[PDB]
Amino acid sequence: GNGQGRDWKMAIKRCSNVAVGVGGKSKKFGEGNFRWAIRMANVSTGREPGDIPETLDQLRLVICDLQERREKFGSSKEIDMAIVTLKVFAVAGLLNMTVSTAAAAENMYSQMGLDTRP
Numbered sequence: 001g002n003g004q005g006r007d008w009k010m011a012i013k014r015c016s017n018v019a020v021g022v023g024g025k026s027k028k029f030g031e032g033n034f035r036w037a038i039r040m041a042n043v044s045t046g047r048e049p050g051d052i053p054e055t056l057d058q059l060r061l062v063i064c065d066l067q068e069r070r071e072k073f074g075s076s077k078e079i080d081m082a083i084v085t086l087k088v089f090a091v092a093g094l095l096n097m098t099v100s101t102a103a104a105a106e107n108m109y110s111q112m113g114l115d116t117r118p
């Protein structure tokens with residue numbers, strides 16, 4: 001499915017209340033940033049451009065693949081933001097759970113046992 005639905009708008013609005021830094025003040029999540037991430041991550045995974053899923057299974061999977069390639073390629077601000085996005089977004093969307101910070105989101109994603117090490 002592709003388009004802007006209740007789950008879509010809600011996903012962006014939810015993460016919108018998330019801090020993308022060490023301290024929440026004037027740098028929350030935005031729609032533009034989400035795209036640059038979800039997109040950069042999608043294309044980076046050799047996945048078609050029209051890949052707009054909407055399932056916890058899809059998010060967890062996409063995040064897993066990005067993790068493997070993230071290491072083999074090394075740690076980068078670009079690859080990091082992209083991954084942290086798919087996570088904070090997956091939980092803030094598929095789980096409708098608003099996280100305090102992008103870091104806390106990704107941390108819980110892997111800490112919960114979602115981001116395995118394949």
